[PDB]
Amino acid sequence: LDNGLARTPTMGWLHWERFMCNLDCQEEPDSCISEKLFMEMAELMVSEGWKDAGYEYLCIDDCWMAPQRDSEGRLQADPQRFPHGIRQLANYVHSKGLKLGIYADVGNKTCAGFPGSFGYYDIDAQTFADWGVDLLKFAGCYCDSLENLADGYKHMSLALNRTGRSIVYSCEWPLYMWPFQKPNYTEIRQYCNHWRNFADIDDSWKSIKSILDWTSFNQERIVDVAGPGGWNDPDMLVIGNFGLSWNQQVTQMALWAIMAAPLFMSNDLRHISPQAKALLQDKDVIAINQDPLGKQGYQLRQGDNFEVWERPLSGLAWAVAMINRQEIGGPRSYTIAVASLGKGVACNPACFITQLLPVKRKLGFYEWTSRLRSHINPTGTVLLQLENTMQMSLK
Amino acid sequence: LDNGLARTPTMGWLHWERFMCNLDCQEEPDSCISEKLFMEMAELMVSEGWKDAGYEYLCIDDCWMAPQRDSEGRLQADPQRFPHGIRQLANYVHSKGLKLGIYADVGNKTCAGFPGSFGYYDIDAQTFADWGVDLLKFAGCYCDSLENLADGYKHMSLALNRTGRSIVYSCEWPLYMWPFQKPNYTEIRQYCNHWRNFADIDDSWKSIKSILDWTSFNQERIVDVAGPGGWNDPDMLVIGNFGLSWNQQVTQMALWAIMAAPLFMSNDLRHISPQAKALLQDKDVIAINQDPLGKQGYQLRQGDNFEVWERPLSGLAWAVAMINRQEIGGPRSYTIAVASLGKGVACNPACFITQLLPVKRKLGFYEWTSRLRSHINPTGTVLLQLENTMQMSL
Ligand SMILES: *[C@@H]1O[C@H](CO)[C@@H](O[C@@H]2O[C@H](CO)[C@@H](O[C@@H]3O[C@H](CO)[C@@H](O)[C@H](O[C@H]4O[C@H](CO)[C@@H](O)[C@H](O)[C@@H]4O)[C@@H]3O)[C@H](O)[C@H]2NC(C)=O)[C@H](O)[C@H]1NC(C)=O
Ligand SMILES: *[C@@H]1O[C@H](CO)[C@@H](O[C@@H]2O[C@H](CO)[C@@H](O[C@@H]3O[C@H](CO)[C@@H](O)[C@H](O[C@H]4O[C@H](CO)[C@@H](O)[C@H](O)[C@@H]4O)[C@@H]3O)[C@H](O)[C@H]2NC(C)=O)[C@H](O)[C@H]1NC(C)=O
Ligand SMILES: *[C@@H]1O[C@H](CO)[C@@H](O[C@@H]2O[C@H](CO)[C@@H](O)[C@H](O)[C@H]2NC(C)=O)[C@H](O)[C@H]1NC(C)=O
Ligand SMILES: OC[C@H]1O[C@H](OC[C@H]2O[C@H](O)[C@H](O)[C@@H](O)[C@@H]2O)[C@H](O)[C@@H](O)[C@H]1O
Ligand SMILES: OC[C@H]1O[C@H](OC[C@H]2O[C@H](O)[C@H](O)[C@@H](O)[C@@H]2O)[C@H](O)[C@@H](O)[C@H]1O
Ligand SMILES: *[C@@H]1O[C@H](CO)[C@@H](O)[C@H](O)[C@H]1NC(C)=O
Ligand SMILES: *[C@@H]1O[C@H](CO)[C@@H](O)[C@H](O)[C@H]1NC(C)=O
Ligand SMILES: *[C@@H]1O[C@H](CO)[C@@H](O)[C@H](O)[C@H]1NC(C)=O
């Protein structure tokens, strides 16, 4: 979407995976979907270095709305969970140097059953803009046809544009066309800053594998369409929660960087381990994700339960991820000819290789004809950055 | 099996899940299947308190033997990787106060392709006993018929007995019987100290779930057959490796205790986190697994992506495990009437409840009519011990 936004993948925090649709503030006030939850996350995004690392969008997902629209046909924030309203929340978030995301649905209801935006696109867009909303995640539940789906996504895009406010537009458009209708990504990209292609992530390694396998399976269709202003969205980072081993967390962080994915954490910033914090704030890995060239990576090869992915970067550099998909045994040796990497230009005549994950380590100079040996933990990933030696010497 | 062994579930260490069939001592000397690997694990089993916690059997799995039998038809320790032989290794292990486990296969080959024991049951049994072997894991690969399968497991059982040496007998009989017909567990119990029922575990939450779901689905067939001398074997503990979140590791430890499972760790004792060590060595959880009554637990109820399991213990006590199977969101509250637990006798007229996992905490006294509320992490388990107040006052 040509709105000057998402020139690199959007980074922030989104409540959904970790907090879901918890409406019980009586029994669980510290985990219910409430203004207090978001104000606390906003404070910690500043104080715990998240904003500094690049995470700037504090985003509300489903279940913020009151059951009905007001007498002027406007969406309402829930009166008891958001008693001070969205505007005051937006002001609070802005005072921290952060941006606010909100959620709506193209159909008659949100996925959780609250008011949908169909028939109210213009009113809702103007409502969000006036509040100072900076991002909209627009979901595709409760839509009677694919024609109405597409039209609704386009209408809301134009309506947001007409407000004159810069608002990141995140769409679930192509997801709802799966598996029989092939999305027109040229069209989707014209209207959206990012788009969900695949089913919801959850707190499991199985879901991460499924997203990676569906991405690589469809990579010819989707990789080249991504770029500054329009990204493939493989869903939230779930690092720091309950269902992932350390190696699986490393794999998600590495691969979301390779995929030029928007980076929306869904976790509890009040209760997150130092290790998970350090991984999510990894300066070098975020720099790969945020690479200005904005070319999405891809799976180069797979076999013997190993996967090699790579991403072209600015300065003729490359990021390379090697995944051990064998879920038994110990750290497993993997050897690759560097000549196979980066279309055969990355290490011609030579490259300098730095390992970034699971630990940072300068590996040295590798000539065009040489081989690279790594040991990779089961379900883990080794992430490397390759610099072509001619680029290095030249200023 | 009535050999006086495995009166409580066997505890030890087994190489397979972590080290597999690594034969490359040239490129990977620290992880190849070699005498040095087992000697190092033996030292650490003592020095790091594993033996003291109850882990006493140091077990060799597949890929210890040479490609061929010797001219006397004996299995041979691989000459490059076990140059000093198994006898010397057994002597070394015994000197540490530990017991040695070894591996063979009922069919023509082991699963990795090494010589199988078919046609050699007596020779192999005598070979093992002479060496000082204390446990045999007997796998079911490359067996052409169900008759040869059953007869082979029976033959080896009797052959080990005939040596006069006490040897724990671990069988894959029901597992290899399953793809064809329901096993006869009465017969299996007669011949085996423990038996593998289900597919191999690996370093994944997926495999743990599959084992639990298979066990709970088939619990009517298998729970009551287990007891002192003969246990259901849901495979190795994989805590301390690569593929499990902390919550998933807690779940495995808790449920292997509920299930009265043999506890064979498969991990690298040279490189194990303090957290994983403390869980695997948890004295209260091990005491549940090792409960002298030896009655296997079971799934009590299931629904709303929660599972409740319980195990009767000696002295009118109960272990209760609550699993959160919802793999999204946060810690989820689960409430149960205590009158539903322990067939309604656990907390009549009251019980004292202590949480053991994920952290140890006394919860208090609960009347028969009361409800217990717990918050459980996604893929995690809360493990409780219930003590009846009648028993406490006595
Ligand atoms: C509503 O829709 C309209 C029409 O699509 C949209 O107008 C577009 O806005 C973008 C972004 O502001 C314009 O793109 C800019 O064009 C100018 C002149 O060519 C450039 O100088 C800009 O360069 C930026 O990006 C560079 C890197 O690529 C940076 O180095 C530099 O610093 C600049 O930031 C940029 O390319 C685009 O021209 C218009 N399109 C048209 C046809 O008018 C408008 O923004 C939308 N409004 C809202 C509120 O959404
Ligand atoms: C080869 O197979 C034979 C026959 O299957 C097997 O002989 C059996 O050994 C067991 C265990 O030693 C015997 O059971 C014991 O019998 C004695 C005497 O009657 C009892 O004292 C024991 O009672 C309990 O008390 C012990 C407390 O110290 C406990 O340790 C024990 O587990 C009991 O709870 C016990 O019942 C059994 O009598 C024989 N069976 C026959 C038919 O002789 C033999 O052990 C096998 N040999 C090898 C080397 O494996
Ligand atoms: C996918 O959508 C794009 C954009 O709507 C289509 O490309 C346009 O095609 C129309 C004619 O139908 C032309 O007027 C425009 O010039 C095209 N725009 C661009 C930017 O290419 C494209 O035809 C669609 N692809 C398919 C196969 O349906
Ligand atoms: O309600 C917010 C939710 O909306 C979308 O997901 C809808 C449903 O998708 C799957 O069926 C999933 O199993 C359910 O949990 C969920 O209700 C959206 O894709 C999500 O990201 C989220 O915003
Ligand atoms: O070779 C030792 C091994 O033997 C048995 O497992 C054989 C194979 O079973 C499955 O196909 C599995 O996927 C493989 O990893 C495995 O090699 C036995 O059940 C194992 O415990 C182990 O002893
Ligand atoms: C919403 O419901 C109305 C009335 O049933 C229907 O006409 C309309 O097409 C629906 N909108 C969508 C996008 O499903
Ligand atoms: C082993 O192979 C021989 C020769 O093919 C065969 O007679 C025998 O039945 C096999 N044994 C088993 C148990 O598979
Ligand atoms: C199991 O085998 C035993 C022989 O040890 C036999 O007595 C028994 O009838 C079998 N069980 C059933 C119910 O088929």
| 3-state SS record for chain B | CCCCCCCCCCEEEECHHHHCCCCCCCCCCCCCCCHHHHHHHHHHHHHCCHHHHCCCEEECCCCCECCCCCCCCCCCECCCCCCCHHHHHHHHHHHCCCEEEEEEECCCECCCCCECCCCCHHHHHHHHHHHCCCEEEEECCCCCCHHHHHHHHHHHHHHHHHCCCCCEEEECHHHHHCCCCCCCHHHHHHHCCEEECCCCCCCCHHHHHHHHHHHHHCHHHHCCCCECCEEEECCCECCCCCCCCHHHHHHHHHHHHHCCCCEEECCCCCCCCHHHHHHHCCHHHHHHHCCCCCCCCEEEEEECCEEEEEEECCCCEEEEEEEECCCCCCCEEEEEEHHHHHHHCCCCCEEEEEEEECCCEEEEEEECCCEEEEEECCCCEEEEEEEEHHHHHC
Compute the distance from residue A125 Cα to the ligand 3 centre, in Å. 26
Cα Rg of chain B (Å, integer): 21
Query: What is the C-alpha separation between B336 and B370, in angstroms, rounded?
Result: 9
Resolution, given in Å to one decimal, reads: 1.9
Phi, psi of B76 (to 5 degrees): -120, 140
Compute the distance from residue B59 Cα to the ligand 7 centre, in Å. 28
Residue type present at position B330: G
Nearest by Cα to A18 from A194, A244, A214, A173: A244
The DSSP code sequence of A288-322 is: HHT-TT----EEEEEETTEEEEEEE-STT-EEEEE
The alpha-helical segments, DSSP class H, found in chain A are 16-19, 35-47, 50-53, 85-95, 121-131, 146-163, 185-191, 205-217, 219-222, 246-258, 274-280, 283-289, 389-393
Q: Which two tokens stand for residue A43?
A: 């404070």
Query: What is the C-alpha separation between A98 and A53, in angstroms, rounded?
Result: 12
Q: Which two tokens stand for residue A243?
A: 């269902």
Using CB atoms within 10 A of its CB, is residue A27 exposed (0-12), middle (13-18) or buried (19+)? exposed
Q: Which residue has the tokens 């803009």?
A: A129
Query: What is the C-alpha separation between B99 and B51, in angstroms, rounded?
Result: 10
Chain A residues with beta carbon closer than 8 angstroms to that of B22: 329
Cα Rg of chain A (Å, integer): 21
CA geometry: angle A202, B359, B9, nearest 5 deg: 95
Nearest by Cα to A196 from A128, A144, A248, A137: A137
Domains of chain A by range and CATH?
Answer: 1-293 (3.20.20.70), 294-395 (2.60.40.1180)
In the sheet where B381-388 sits, what is the strand order? B298-303, B306-312, B317-324, B381-388, B350-357, B361-367
Quick one: residue A235, left, alpha or beta (phi over 0 = left, psi -120 to 50 = alpha)?
left
User: Shortest Cα distance from A325 to chain B (angstroms)?
Assistant: 11
Query: What is the C-alpha separation between A304 and A306, in angstroms, rounded?
Result: 5
Residue B350 contacts residue B387 (beta carbons within 8 Å): no
Nearest by Cα to A159 from A203, A121, A209, A215: A121
Compute the distance from residue B4 Cα to the ligand 2 centre, in Å. 5
Q: Which two tokens stand for residue B247?
A: 């919550």
Pairing of β A231-233 and β A194-196: parallel
Query: What is the C-alpha separation between B284 and B294, in angstroms, rounded?
Result: 16
Query: What is the C-alpha separation between A44 and A50, in angstroms, rounded?
Result: 8
Beta pairing partners, B138: B104, B171
Quick one: residue B325, left, alpha or beta (phi over 0 = left, psi -120 to 50 = alpha)?
alpha
Nearest by Cα to B239 from B22, B50, B376: B50
Smallest CA–CA distance from B327 into chain A, residue: A203
Query: What is the C-alpha separation between A81 and A150, in angstroms, rounded?
Result: 33
Pairing of β A57-59 and β A11-14: parallel
Cβ-based neighbours of B271, under 8 Å, separated by 6 or more: none
Using CB atoms within 10 A of its CB, is residue A184 exposed (0-12), middle (13-18) or buried (19+)? middle
Cβ A166 under 6 angstroms from ligand 1: yes
Beta pairing partners, A230: A227
Residue B278 contacts residue B50 (beta carbons within 8 Å): no
Contact A330 B204 (CB under 8 A): no
Question: Nearest Cβ partner of A245 from B17, B202, B244?
Answer: B244
Query: What is the C-alpha separation between A110 and A141, in angstroms, rounded?
Result: 6
Sign of the Cα pseudo-torsion (A254, A260, A266, A267, in order) = positive
Other CB atoms within 10 Å distance of the CB of residue A69: 15
Q: Which two tokens stand for residue A281?
A: 């704030």
Query: What is the C-alpha separation between A263 and A10, in angstroms, rounded?
Result: 6
Minimum CA distance residue for ligand 7 atom 5: B108
Cβ-based neighbours of B238, under 8 Å, separated by 6 or more: B17, B18, B201, B202, B203, B208, B244, B252, B266, B267
Choosing from B138, B144, B176 the residue with most ligand 7 atoms within 8 A of its CB, the one to mutate for a pocket test is B144
Cβ A61 under 6 angstroms from ligand 4: yes
Nearest by Cα to A322 from A304, A344, A307: A307
DSSP character at residue A126: H
Contact A328 B203 (CB under 8 A): yes
Nearest by Cα to B199 from B220, B230, B172, B180: B172
Q: Which residue has the tokens 């002597």?
A: B91
Chain A residues with beta carbon closer than 8 angstroms to that of B242: 245, 247, 330, 377-380
Q: Which two tokens stand for residue B50?
A: 């594993």
Cβ-based neighbours of B287, under 8 Å, separated by 6 or more: none
Other CB atoms within 10 Å distance of the CB of residue A68: 10
Q: Which two tokens stand for residue B130?
A: 């002479």
Helix (H, G, I), strand (E, B) or coil at A11: strand
Residue type present at position A30: D
Compute the distance from residue A1 Cα to the ligand 1 centre, in Å. 10
Minimum CA distance residue for ligand 6 atom 3: A108
Contact B17 A245 (CB under 8 A): no
Can you give the length of chain A in residues? 395
Query: What is the C-alpha separation between A54 and A202, in angstroms, rounded?
Result: 23
Other CB atoms within 10 Å distance of the CB of residue A19: 22
Beta pairing partners, B103: B137
Q: Which two tokens stand for residue B267?
A: 């991990």
Q: Which residue has the tokens 């009113």?
A: A123
Contact A245 B247 (CB under 8 A): no
Query: What is the C-alpha separation between A153 and A169, in angstroms, rounded?
Result: 10
Cβ-based neighbours of B308, under 8 Å, separated by 6 or more: B299, B300, B301, B302, B320, B321, B322, B323, B336
Query: What is the C-alpha separation between B359 and A52, in angstroms, rounded?
Result: 35
Contact B242 A379 (CB under 8 A): yes
Helices A85-95 & A35-47 angle (0-180, nearest 10):
10
